[PDB]
Amino acid sequence: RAELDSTVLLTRSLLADTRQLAAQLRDKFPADGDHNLDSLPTLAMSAGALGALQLPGVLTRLRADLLSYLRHVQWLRRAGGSSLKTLEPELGTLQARLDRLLRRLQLLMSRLALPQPPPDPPAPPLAPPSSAWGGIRAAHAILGGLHLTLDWAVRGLLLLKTRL
Amino acid sequence: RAELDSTVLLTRSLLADTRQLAAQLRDKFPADGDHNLDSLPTLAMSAGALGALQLPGVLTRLRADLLSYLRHVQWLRRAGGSSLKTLEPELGTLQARLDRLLRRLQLLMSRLALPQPPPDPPAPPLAPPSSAWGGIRAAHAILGGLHLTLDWAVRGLLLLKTRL
Amino acid sequence: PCPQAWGPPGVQYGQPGRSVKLCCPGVTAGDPVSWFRDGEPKLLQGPDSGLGHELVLAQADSTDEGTYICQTLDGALGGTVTLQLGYPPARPVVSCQAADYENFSCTWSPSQISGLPTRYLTSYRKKTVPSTGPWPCPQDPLGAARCVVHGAEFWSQYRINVTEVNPLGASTRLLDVSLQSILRPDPPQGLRVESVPGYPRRLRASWTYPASWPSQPHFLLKFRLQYRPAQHPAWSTVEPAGLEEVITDAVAGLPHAVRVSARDFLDAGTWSTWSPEAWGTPS
Amino acid sequence: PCPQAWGPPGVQYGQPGRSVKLCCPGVTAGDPVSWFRDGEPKLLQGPDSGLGHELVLAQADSTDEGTYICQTLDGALGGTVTLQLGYPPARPVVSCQAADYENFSCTWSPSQISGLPTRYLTSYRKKTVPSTGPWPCPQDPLGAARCVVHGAEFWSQYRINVTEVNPLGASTRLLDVSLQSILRPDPPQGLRVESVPGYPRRLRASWTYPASWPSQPHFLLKFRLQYRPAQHPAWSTVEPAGLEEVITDAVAGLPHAVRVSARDFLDAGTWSTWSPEAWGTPS
Amino acid sequence: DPCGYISPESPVVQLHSNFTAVCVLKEKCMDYFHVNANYIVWKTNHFTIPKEQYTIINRTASSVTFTDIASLNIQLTCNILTFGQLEQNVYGITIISGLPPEKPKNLSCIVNEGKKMRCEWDGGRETHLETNFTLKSEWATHKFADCKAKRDTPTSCTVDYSTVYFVNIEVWVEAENALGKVTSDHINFDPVYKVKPNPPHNLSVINSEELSSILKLTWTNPSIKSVIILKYNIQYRTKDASTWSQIPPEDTASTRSSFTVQDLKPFTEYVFRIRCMKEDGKGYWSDWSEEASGITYE
Amino acid sequence: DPCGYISPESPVVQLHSNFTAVCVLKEKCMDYFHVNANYIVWKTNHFTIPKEQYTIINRTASSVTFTDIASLNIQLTCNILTFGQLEQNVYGITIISGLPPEKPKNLSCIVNEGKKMRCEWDGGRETHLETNFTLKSEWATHKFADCKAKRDTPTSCTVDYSTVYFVNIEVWVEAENALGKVTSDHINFDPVYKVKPNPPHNLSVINSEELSSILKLTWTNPSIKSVIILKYNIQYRTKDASTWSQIPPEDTASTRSSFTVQDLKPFTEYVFRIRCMKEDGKGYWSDWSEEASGITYE
Ligand SMILES: *[C@@H]1O[C@H](CO)[C@@H](O[C@@H]2O[C@H](CO)[C@@H](O[C@@H]3O[C@H](CO)[C@@H](O)[C@H](O)[C@@H]3O)[C@H](O)[C@H]2NC(C)=O)[C@H](O)[C@H]1NC(C)=O
Ligand SMILES: *[C@@H]1O[C@H](CO)[C@@H](O[C@@H]2O[C@H](CO)[C@@H](O[C@@H]3O[C@H](CO)[C@@H](O)[C@H](O)[C@@H]3O)[C@H](O)[C@H]2NC(C)=O)[C@H](O)[C@H]1NC(C)=O
Ligand SMILES: *[C@@H]1O[C@H](CO)[C@@H](O[C@@H]2O[C@H](CO)[C@@H](O)[C@H](O)[C@H]2NC(C)=O)[C@H](O)[C@H]1NC(C)=O
Ligand SMILES: *[C@@H]1O[C@H](CO)[C@@H](O[C@@H]2O[C@H](CO)[C@@H](O)[C@H](O)[C@H]2NC(C)=O)[C@H](O)[C@H]1NC(C)=O
Ligand SMILES: *[C@@H]1O[C@H](CO)[C@@H](O)[C@H](O)[C@H]1NC(C)=O
Ligand SMILES: *[C@@H]1O[C@H](CO)[C@@H](O)[C@H](O)[C@H]1NC(C)=O
Ligand SMILES: *[C@@H]1O[C@H](CO)[C@@H](O)[C@H](O)[C@H]1NC(C)=O
Ligand SMILES: *[C@@H]1O[C@H](CO)[C@@H](O)[C@H](O)[C@H]1NC(C)=O
Ligand SMILES: *[C@@H]1O[C@H](CO)[C@@H](O)[C@H](O)[C@H]1NC(C)=O
Ligand SMILES: *[C@@H]1O[C@H](CO)[C@@H](O)[C@H](O)[C@H]1NC(C)=O
């Protein structure tokens, strides 16, 4: 499908941007330990063979995770603290590319006449960081979780092409 | 008096600025007839010999007239209509020089230990112009009345030096 | 009796194409009187029946201009009237001026001459938005074409009123005049030019106020000087401070013309006419 | 009876400066027994009074290392024990690796040898914030220094647990490992170089995937090629598309070395080691 | 209170057209001075309007008709001739004239690396009126933010949103002024085919080995290599040559970070310069790199 | 919840001084892992801090002392060595260093005709810290609006209020940064003595009359003549001369709009240039006018 080809190309682009900024961040603000947040999804639970699964669940699952990540990325910029102004304008560019891709995903489902998932209840607001450094620690958890989601997204979209 | 000398020099400067802008205005937006406004003072009632009068009345009289003119000049800028934007930035510069001179007049009275006049009741708001051209017609009345006031101001201040 | 005359005591006036009503001057109103055309014996009539105190002419054309005689039936000459034809006055032409800051004066000319006796009523008022109503402007010598207003308000506006009236109607000229706009001082007097020893290209010009301008700290005058060497076509202009100006670019060995004019020190009114030229030659 | 042994059935172990408690192996706990030093007839004693089932030595120094004999009072040899002195194990050195995206494997070495029998317990768990608790890592052949985990989650993080224990204590090495970070594929195989007729400065390189990497649309590999002519000191680097690359700047008439490496197509893990060099010479 | 007004308030008309202005006096003003439409005289910018161009409609209003309007700015004033020897202002208006905007043509866009999408277009005939320019771009499922041109650059706009490659975008420019509204033709393209990469940097020449007549060129490619495949143009000439030569494009038709130039004369100094663009030739050539010098071995 | 924090949050210190950082662990974190201050290791920007610089104060806190601080930016991290074979981050802070601002010197202002008052000053030693500059001016009876320097021109400011001649104004610059606040010396002056007029325009030379060797210069003075009396400097030279000559200032010491230059050679071409400033020499000379050419008569 020509429409599926175009969407996959843009996903690889966003994955590369996320990896570079995450690696740049650890060089300037090193992280010691794997950081987690209760408000971030922890849906990235699977092995290799997971390709096996069907299309409706993957697209629904991708959409829910990315909307949470968009909220968290935007939250980081407006209130993360002056310590993270150095991650601009790259962080703001990353935010803008992600909102449009979510739109592209809704269009893909519409053009393929797929059932749309029910509007899930949006997650409550993230509390502001307790300190400037707490926001930096939160960024490591967010970027690591994002690039993992995107890594599994590229793979999954390529698998569907292999079937339909 | 050195203080009186300085104040007189600044008054001649403001008179020249007012004459030039009033003459510039009639060249671009001609006026047909002598225009009046009920809200403007009509205190400029006197002949030549009026120099005769005493100092407290002249300074009190100058202060009351200029405060009304300041209100009217500021009123013209913020609401006179787009037709009069061409009179900027000269009109805004004229407004700024006039407020300070009023301050200088209050200082003169304080330094000379003169009785200060009682705070008179400020005049009610000027109604907005009924049309863009009504504002232009109002400007001719205001500038003509202002430059006449200033012309008689220069003369009066010079007369006081001749006595005390 | 009859409407009393305008000029001389036994002559009346009329307009072509109108009705004109002559009266017998020295006859009681109500006495029957007879009318004749000079050299013509016919008893004249007029539109109201035929025997009154007044002859009327609806004709009014040029052939009707001349001398008429009225007499009572006893033979006594009750008077003579001359019908001179004309036209109502035209609007007069009015100008005002002022060479000082206290008083001003105005003059007037007819815009058209009628050939009929003429006179002018003059007055003025102060527009506002102390009786500031209509005030007469007295004509100082005899009944000249000039009136003077003393102690005028310098900043106030005046509406000058010259009204022409003749025996057949009236026309009023109104002229707005403000002392601050109309003022024009006389030129300075006594312009002199002197050489400046040691400097072959400098001249010193000096002058005084005009006599019509009393020197006063309240109304100074600013000055504008122009100078030009003999045979040169173009004036050079400076704006001197005070009553003196040293020219520094005088052409060596040449007569120089210098002239100056005056204006109100606060740029009121207009510049005076140029003084008579005065000449000097650098040392 | 007495604490059962560690290795062989009748030998016990101890640490210098400690207290060591030898037991008579083939004697019922509670039977009085006698102890001797080899070649020395003296009945040995220990801190709890003098006639038990177990000899104790608080001395523990090197002269105390050797063979001890215990016998019951009847004369029957109830057993023999050898005291070998040593030290607890040091922390072991652990590394893991993975040449594919499904399974990975880890190996371990002692950081210090004690001269005492040694063995390793291995296990791992998945940190979260389906029993994801501790799962054993089985050692595949015999009890080698290697265990394999099949069907591991690619993105999840695992805490690998190698714990060394000896007869005197234990020390556990923990190593965090994520499949996405540790992965390193094997180099491509079959690198061949061929001349390009008509073009004296082009060579075509071709190669295939490594056999340990199954070709799949889900995990491609990206490639990085380096080439260098014989006698040249500096490598040139290109980033080829696909399994082929035409070099266009080969020096004429000279053997050229070419080598390539592999990495996960989404830049996961690290680049492989360089392939064996293959040589070719332009036509 | 005023005597009257002029209608329309402040019209703008097209050059060579006709305009009729009507001044109407209030009954109250006409009564006090005892005048009517016949007493109206029109004057503009110190020039007396000839009485013959007036048309008295009602006793309250007079009108004038301008033909072949040719003045860019007309100040119109309506006056009455009171008691025949004075004149007072009734009303006034300012008349502005000009031309409608021309249809924008030759619309083209460019994406300079590190900057947001920028589009350029040719403006047409001068209109003499204040004209605003807004760059429009929108997807089939989303209307995008307007781009408002800057005072300095009214013929160009630079969007405020980051470029998104691999998605077709519909773009057009909308020109509008007081006399008219018009839209340029719509264009459709993939931003990936309009990239203008930065020029190569980190240029190195390296000296020759034990073999002479050979020079290897090295440089660092621009970060943009992660989205598109680069193609290059390598030019070279002798230190004294007047024109540049060029390597056959086919030999440098794909991404690379080095190249060895051959058949150069021994112990001769050579100058090099390079440029790059998308491999398929769809886009814009980058600028030339920094100049580089080198010397062959002995 | 986190295990601890470092205090002070984000300090800024002066170069060559000392800084002590204290990391404190919460009781709950110490209990779960069974550790205390003795287990803290400090690392910064990939460099292991040597254990010997640590000082364990309480069982909950460890501290390090830096001497002769020389790094402009230090990223500090506090870590604990859990169960001896892993390391987890407790807290982190960023340490910034630099110097206090130097006292601004050589403060001077200038009023360019048509522009608002502008003041210039010499900044001192680089401070390596973000420093804001605000120009202060105030009357004895009024505190005036602050002037905030622009990113491009941090050593200059242009007020937003129009110039008021004939009134003494008190002006000074205030320099402040994270390490210190200081004010420049206060200056006092009448704006009338700091004017920089525009250069003369409308330059005309006029040809010679029936007498030769004479040229009259005319020009239009700048509008600023209404407030100050102008003085001029007229320079002239022959079309081939290499240096300019000048009329004696005393002859052109007062306002004028023309001057006739004498003793010039017949049928010779002359070039002129003029400049002006306040008659009393208090202020700044304007730029040179446009060049003018002329020819003497036959
Ligand atoms: C300008 O001045 C002249 C002269 O003063 C004014 O002419 C004057 O006109 C008024 C009418 O407004 C005359 O009033 C008279 O009223 C009586 C009673 O009704 C009547 O019998 C007269 O025929 C006339 O209407 C006044 O006589 C006349 N002045 C003279 C000397 O004859 C003129 O009105 C003035 N215009 C202004 C001030 O605008
Ligand atoms: C890493 O893996 C090793 C091996 O599985 C772990 O060593 C294990 O440590 C636990 C203590 O947490 C031992 O539990 C036992 O509890 C009983 C009852 O209280 C007691 O008798 C033992 O002395 C011991 O404490 C467990 O036996 C031991 N494993 C083996 C094979 O001996 C280690 O804890 C792991 N570390 C992690 C997962 O962080
Ligand atoms: C005199 O002419 C004016 C001008 O046309 C008339 O005013 C117009 O009246 C109509 C409706 O009656 C309105 O739609 C127009 O907008 C009016 N014109 C303006 C300029 O406002 C007026 O009614 C006429 N008066 C008479 C008595 O005929
Ligand atoms: C251990 O040391 C810390 C560090 O000084 C102590 O915390 C300080 O307590 C005082 C008052 O008790 C406060 O003013 C300081 O602000 C605290 N320091 C910090 C960094 O917050 C702590 O009280 C000490 N604990 C014990 C048991 O001695
Ligand atoms: C103005 O009139 C007064 C009144 O008599 C007279 O004294 C004075 O001299 C006049 N002014 C001038 C300048 O003549
Ligand atoms: C991973 O383990 C499975 C389980 O037997 C095996 O079939 C597969 O071949 C292994 N993967 C590789 C690359 O050998
Ligand atoms: C008035 O307008 C018409 C049509 O727009 C035009 O033909 C004509 O020339 C104009 N001028 C007139 C009628 O004076
Ligand atoms: C565009 O038109 C609007 C009309 O409201 C005007 O206010 C504005 O100044 C014009 N120019 C710009 C750049 O917006
Ligand atoms: C600590 O600070 C003091 C005073 O500021 C200084 O003399 C000393 O050299 C510094 N360094 C130390 C004590 O290591
Ligand atoms: C000056 O300091 C303030 C501190 O609140 C900071 O926000 C601002 O960015 C700095 N610079 C300027 C130009 O205001």
Residue numbers in the entry:
A (entry chain B), B (entry chain E): 15 to 178
C (entry chain F), D (entry chain C): 3 to 131, 141 to 294
E (entry chain A), F (entry chain D): 4 to 301
The article reads:
Interleukin (IL-), an IL-6 family cytokine, has pivotal roles in autoimmune diseases, fibrotic complications, and solid cancers. IL-11 activates downstream signalling pathways by binding its two cell surface receptors: the IL-11 specific receptor, IL-11Rα, and the signal-transducing receptor, glycoprotein (gp)13013,26. Following the formation of the receptor complex, the Janus kinase (JAK)/signal transducer and activator of stat (STAT) and extracellular signal regulated kinase (ERK)/mitogen-activated protein kinase (MAPK) pathways are primarily activated. IL-11 and IL-6 utilise a homodimer of gp13026,34,35 while other IL-6 family members exploit a heterodimer of gp130 with a second signal-transducing receptor, such as LIF receptor (LIFR), OSM receptor (OSMR), IL-27R/WSX-1 or IL-12 receptor β−2 subunit (IL-12Rβ2).
To understand the molecular mechanisms underpinning human IL-11 signalling complex formation, we solved three structures of the complex containing either the cytokine binding domains of gp130 (gp130D1-D3) or the complete extracellular domains of gp130 (gp130EC) using electron cryo-microscopy (cryo-EM) and X-ray crystallography. We also obtained crystals of the IL-11FL/IL-11RαEC/gp130D1-D3 complex that diffracted anisotropically to 3.8 Å. We used the cryo-EM structure of the gp130D1-D3 complex to phase the X-ray diffraction data by molecular replacement. Three IL-11 signalling complexes were arranged in a triangular configuration in the asymmetric unit providing 6-fold non-crystallographic symmetry to aid refinement. Satisfactory density defining the positions of the β-sheets of IL-11Rα D1 facilitated refinement of the domain in the gp130EC complex and the crystal structure, confirming the average positions of this domain in the complex. N-linked glycans were visible on IL-11Rα (N105, N172) and gp130 (N21, N61, N135) in all structures.
